[PDB]
């Protein structure tokens, strides 16, 4: 069925809000977060980050219909942002972007509180 339940629509809107957010200069903050690079490409990432997470993984779980609720999806986003903030330095752009996107995530959830 092409029709999403309300819970599915909400999950999609949250996801899409983070994905599509662009700053005043037209930059899409989510670009770097979509797909994690490999073990070779990011030294020490997978030894040091306990639960790797990227937006493609989140998107797949959503498409397979495995978030039972909004908080579960939020959890995964927060894990991703924390991972990025653990691995990268505060001065790095990825770290700054993770902070903005975290605010985008919570604002969006909060805005959709009564759907
Ligand atoms: O730390 C992360 C770092 C990167 C990353 C992606 C592309 C690059 O050219 C780069 O120099 C770093 O991508 C991520 C993507 C994520 O979803 C989560 C992360 O923690 C990272
Ligand atoms: K750090």
Curated annotation (Swiss-Prot):
Changing residue 23 to E: Found in a case of clear cell renal carcinoma; somatic mutation. It is found in: Nucleus. The modification Phosphoserine is found at residue 38. There is a cross-link at residue 2 (Glycyl lysine isopeptide (Lys-Gly) (interchain with G-Cter in SUMO2)). Residues 2-112 form the Bromo domain. Signal peptide: none annotated. Involved in transcriptional activation and repression of select genes by chromatin remodeling (alteration of DNA-nucleosome topology). Required for the stability of the SWI/SNF chromatin remodeling complex SWI/SNF-B (PBAF). Acts as a negative regulator of cell proliferation. It is linked to Renal cell carcinoma: Renal cell carcinoma is a heterogeneous group of sporadic or hereditary carcinoma derived from cells of the proximal renal tubular epithelium. It is subclassified into clear cell renal carcinoma (non-papillary carcinoma), papillary renal cell carcinoma, chromophobe renal cell carcinoma, collecting duct carcinoma with medullary carcinoma of the kidney, and unclassified renal cell carcinoma. Clear cell renal cell carcinoma is the most common subtype. This is Protein polybromo-1. It comes from Homo sapiens. The lineage of its organism: Eukaryota, Metazoa, Chordata, Craniata, Vertebrata. The gene is PBRM1. The chain holds residues 652 to 766 of 1689 of the full protein.
């Amino acid at each position: 069925s092409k029709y999403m339940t309300p819970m599915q629509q909400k999950l999609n809107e949250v996801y899409e809000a983070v994905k599509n957010y662009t700053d005043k200069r037209g930059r899409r903050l989510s670009a770097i977060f979509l797909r994690l690079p490999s073990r070779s490409e990011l030294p020490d990432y997978y030894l040091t980050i306990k639960k790797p997470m990227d937006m493609e993984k989140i998107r797949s779980h959503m498409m397979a219909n495995k978030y039972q609720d909004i908080d579960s999806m939020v959890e995964d986003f927060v894990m991703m942002f924390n991972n990025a903030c653990t691995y990268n330095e505060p001065e790095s752009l990825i770290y700054k972007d993770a902070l903005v996107l975290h605010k985008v995530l919570l604002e969006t959830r909060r805005d959709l509180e009564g759907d």
